[PDB]
Design a binder for these strands. Structure first.
Lengths: 785, 36, 73
RNA sequence: CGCAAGGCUGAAAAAUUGACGGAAGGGCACCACCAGGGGUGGAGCCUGCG
RNA sequence: CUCUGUCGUGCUGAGGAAUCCCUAGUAAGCGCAAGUCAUCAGCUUGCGUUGAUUACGUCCCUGCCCUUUGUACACACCGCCCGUCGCUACUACCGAU
């Protein structure tokens, strides 16, 4: 019951996620690991890879005033801080809900602003490891952040927001694009200007200067427009010279110069690249007179261009350690030392033990690859209908044969003896090539999606588009049987080492196990959330497990199954794209899995409540009156130092706090709580009622609990002494408040009577005739009995 | 018996007598006795 | 919010004379939001609030009674 | 008497109305608190249940 | 059961931890009668007699039910309860075919 573990992972330079950094090293993002290359020699320096995390990394930032510390933002919402000296994560920050997308650092590097796709921007302290605060604007996702202190951000709702940081609320907003979306932000390093790139190819230009009045900081000084009308991915400024680079996700990067805003900014140069660039970045090398623009493409490459300031040359490139588009097939050697990977545009064969590429060929498209025994030559069936043949040791192309006319070779299987190969195509036929010379063909009803042989070369099995499988005999091609019951067409199949089992992977999201004597389905087992691409048995039963098989599907999963006990024994995660191909070793000890990820991998009490609030307010009143006496003596520094509950509730007055704790309780509970209150607690309540009536708020509640206090303690008040003083104060204050409120409402009702009579006088009638029958609210009021 | 209970609960049909209005005769529409 | 509505209504009546508020003519005066029904609603709710505060004052003379008893002692 | 009575087959959804909670406030209870009382449980007999 | 006499503690010992039940003609004692198409003589069900202590409050503990929508209108009072997701509509993004 031996499981599988990730041991190796390779075949990848920069992913389609954003944010390349330069340091003469290029620090880019592979899927979950952030890896740093030399650009001069193609050997990577290091990889930063964490065992606790699996989510993909999508934002990189270099700290200023201290390189060899970096901030990476992942897909789950976490941030890690790495070192380039030692490849560990010193601190981790789990603050956001989803998908960190833009990082930013302070000038001093003690403060870190991270804006997500869940639209929160959270700023982080780097000496206390506490989430400082959470700035909250922005209808949808934030696409630009910068530290000006002050913060300047821009979001996908086309708003630039200028936030303060001493008082954590926004000072300014402006709307960059009227009906579009502001997509990128670029700040001048001296904070004089900011240009924001919008959806139409329009670049808006803003000038920056360096509360009760009209505050005006950002000014739309003009609009610019670039050449290509795409959603612009980034705007990067030169840290030293007067240039910037604007690019969308396309094959052009437009470098403009800093000398109307159209007179201020002119395009210096337009750089064409071989692939769609995802993120450009700036590089300045010590001792050169140039501009080292480092582009990182979506098509799996880094390019360093030299731009002459006062044309482009493809100066440096990193393409050897990765396939450039997308791996469609893998086929690993009989000696299991090297493997071949077949991608659209290329063949690249690799060593397992060193995980470094050895040979490279160019083909048009590469559906299916498999080498011939002796591992000297390889076979590739392409989309255009042909079968190409290459060889490893001399690294060349031997032969090419138009197998089918324009119909893609969907299946290639080498004979287990090793003298023939079979190509099943997108035409109806499936052809046999003996070595290569065409020996026998097989015409069948529909397009053959996948065919495989038997390990003892006895029976063949094609798998059509008609959602069916035809198992034939190998010697003469007579129909042995056919397997049915698939709702959607069969994508793959693999049959057992003794030919007593077939697994059959379909597009209806399940795999089937057939017995291959009588072809009875053993058990249809629904095991993947999407259409299962491929299946493979481990070939050797030397280890006692030959009836186990792997299945790889579009839901980013491999699954290790047991066909004897019909049970999933392991679930293999770790791929971030739809896994297209996989293969197992001939020893079966490891397997390779090649994805849409472009990364091929190798696997081995109410009254007591108001009473304590009364006491809190009483201590607050004593501290405030002592602070009044101190500030009356001298204007020296005197802190009141009130309760942390008050400075956490927000420096409210004790009157407001005790009013809220009297307001929260329902009226019957208020009656019971004031009844349960003792006469030691009564005088504090009477002082706070004096405070309410003085600073009038909830006068009916104040009078209600005051008359309840007097009526439930009338004898004790008229026997005590200090109640005379505080009750005289509350009498004067309450009588003034009641007389003020009553006189205001009396003036209101008298004015409403006057204006109502005047409006009646306006309304009465104009004409006079014989019929004064022209000169009332009515309600309905149903009642059941 | 347990499977009978599960079938009735799932495709829920219960034989409890239901609370009827006491004035279904004179007030069959069930109007509300307030503002109209 | 009755006290804050009564206070800014007091400021409104003390600022503008009665003839302006009677000859107030605004294009959005139709049905339930015309000037008659608006001033009627304001007047009747102010009558209720005034009745409440009058009951409160009459009940609030208890404090003068208690202070008179303590003056007697 | 006629139809029912021909096996892509081989046992283990709905939703603008839905899924699950939390906090506050009520009502009730010898399956709760409070005050007491009484069984059973110790010896022997035996119905019954396992 | 009440009253009156004769003798006087003498293998001639009122049930542990737990667990359950009980608030007025109730707990508990006592006998008499019947044997009703199921059950019940190793008992069942009636019937009379004698008849207390202690609660009769509170949601503090353990829970159970329910409000936060409706179901009526005056007085009067209250004053937008909170979270994690789904579903629907629209908007733009990502990358293979």
């Amino acid at each position: 019951y031996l499981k599988f573990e990730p041991s190796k992972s390779f075949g990848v330079v920069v992913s389609s996620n954003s944010n390349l950094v330069w340091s003469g090293q290029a620090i880019v993002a592979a899927n979950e690991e952030v890896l740093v290359w030399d650009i001069k020699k193609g050997e990577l320096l290091s990889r930063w890879r964490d065992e606790n995390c699996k989510f993909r990394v999508t934002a990189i930032a270099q700290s200023r005033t201290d390189p060899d510390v970096f901030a990476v933002g992942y897909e789950d919402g976490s941030i890690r801080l790495w070192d380039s000296k030692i490849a560990t994560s010193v601190v981790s920050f789990n603050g956001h809900k989803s998908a960190i997308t833009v990082l930013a650092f302070d000038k001093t590097g003690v403060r870190l602003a991270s804006g997500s796709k869940d639209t929160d921007i959270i700023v982080w302290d780097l000496v206390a490891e506490v989430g400082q605060y959470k700035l909250r604007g922005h209808k949808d996702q934030v696409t630009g952040l910068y530290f000006i202190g002050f913060l300047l951000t821009t979001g996908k709702d086309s708003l630039i927001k200028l936030w303060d940081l001493s008082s954590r609320h926004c000072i300014e907003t402006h709307v960059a694009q009227a009906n579009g979306e502001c997509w990128a932000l670029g700040v001048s390093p001296d904070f004089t200007g900011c240009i924001t790139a919008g959806n139409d190819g329009e670049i808006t230009v803003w000038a920056l200067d360096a509360l009760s009045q009209s505050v005006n900081f950002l000014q739309n000084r003009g609009t610019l427009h670039r050449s290509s009308k795409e959603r612009a991915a980034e705007v990067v400024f030169h840290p030293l010279r007067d240039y910037f680079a604007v690019h969308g996700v396309e094959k052009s990067v437009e470098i403009w110069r800093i000398r109307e805003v159209s007179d201020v900014f002119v395009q210096h140069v337009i750089v064409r690249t071989t692939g769609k660039v995802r993120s450009v970045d700036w590089a300045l090398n010590p001792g050169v007179k140039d501009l080292q623009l480092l582009v990182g493409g979506t098509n799996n490459l880094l390019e360093l261009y030299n731009i002459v300031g006062k044309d482009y040359n493809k100066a440096l490139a990193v393409e050897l350690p990765g396939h450039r588009t997308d791996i469609r097939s893998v086929a690993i050697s009989s000696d299991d030392k090297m493997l071949a990977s077949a991608a659209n545009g290329s063949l690249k064969i690799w060593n397992i033990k060193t995980q470094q590429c050895i040979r490279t060929f160019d083909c048009g498209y590469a559906l299916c690859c498999a080498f011939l025994p002796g591992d000297k030559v390889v076979i590739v069936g392409t989309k255009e209908g042909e079968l190409q043949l290459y060889d490893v040791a001399s690294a060349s192309l031997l032969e090419t044969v138009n197998a089918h006319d324009g119909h893609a070779v969907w299946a290639l299987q080498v004979h287990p003896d090793g003298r023939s190969v079979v190509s099943g195509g997108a035409d109806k036929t499936a052809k046999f090539w003996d070595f290569l010379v065409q020996s026998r063909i097989l015409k069948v009803s529909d397009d053959i999606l996948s065919l495989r042989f038997s390990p003892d070369a006895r029976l063949l099995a094609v798998a059509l588009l008609d959602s069916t499988v035809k198992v034939f005999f190998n010697d003469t091609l007579k129909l042995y049987l056919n397997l049915y019951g698939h709702k959607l067409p069969v994508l793959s199949m693999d049959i057992s080492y003794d030919s007593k089992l077939i697994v059959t992977s379909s597009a209806d999201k399940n795999i089937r196990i057939w017995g291959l004597d009588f072809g009875d389905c053993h058990k249809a087992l629904f095991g993947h959330q999407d259409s299962i691409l491929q299946v493979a048995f481990i070939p050797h039963n030397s280890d006692g497990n030959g009836h186990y098989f792997f299945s790889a599907s579009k839901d980013r999963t491999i699954k290790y199954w047991d066909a004897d006990k019909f049970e999933q024994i392991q679930r293999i995660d770790g791929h971030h794209g739809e896994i297209w191909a996989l293969a197992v070793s001939h020893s079966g000890r490891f397997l390779v899995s090649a994805s849409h990820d472009k990364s091929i991998r190798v696997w081995e009490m109410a009254g007591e409540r108001i009473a304590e609030a009364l006491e809190l307010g009483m201590t607050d009143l004593n501290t405030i009156r002592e602070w009044e006496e101190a500030r009356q003596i001298n204007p020296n520094i005197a802190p009141p130092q009130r309760n942390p509950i008050f400075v956490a509730l927000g420096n409210i007055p004790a009157e407001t706090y005790v009013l809220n704790t009297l307001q929260k309780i329902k009226p019957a509970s208020l009656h019971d709580a004031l009844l349960v209150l003792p006469f030691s607690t009564i005088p504090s309540l009477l002082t706070f009622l004096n405070l309410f009536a003085q600073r009038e708020l909830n006068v009916p509640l104040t009078c209600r609990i005051l008359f309840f206090v007097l009526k439930t303690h009338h004898k004790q008040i008229v026997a005590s002494r200090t109640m005379r003083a505080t009750l005289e104060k509350v009498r004067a204050n309450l009588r003034a408040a009641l007389r003020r409120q009553k006189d205001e409402m009396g003036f209101n009702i008298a004015a409403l009577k006057v204006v109502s009579m005047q409006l009646r006088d306006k309304s009465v009638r104009e004409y006079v005739d014989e019929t004064w029958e022209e000169k009332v609210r009515k309600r309905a009021f149903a009642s059941l009995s | 018996i347990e499977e009978l209970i599960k079938r009735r609960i799932l495709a829920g049909e219960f034989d409890e007598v239901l609370r009827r209005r006491p004035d279904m005769f004179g007030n069959p529409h069930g109007v509300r006795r307030g503002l109209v | 919010t009755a006290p804050v509505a009564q206070r800014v209504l007091w400021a409104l009546f003390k600022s503008h004379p009665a003839n302006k508020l009677s000859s107030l003519s605004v294009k959005g005066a139709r049905g339930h939001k015309s000037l008659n029904e608006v001033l009627d609603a304001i007047k009747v709710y102010t009558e209720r609030h005034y009745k409440r505060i009058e009951e409160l004052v009459d009940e609030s003379y208890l404090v003068e009674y208690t202070l008179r008893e303590m003056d007697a002692l």
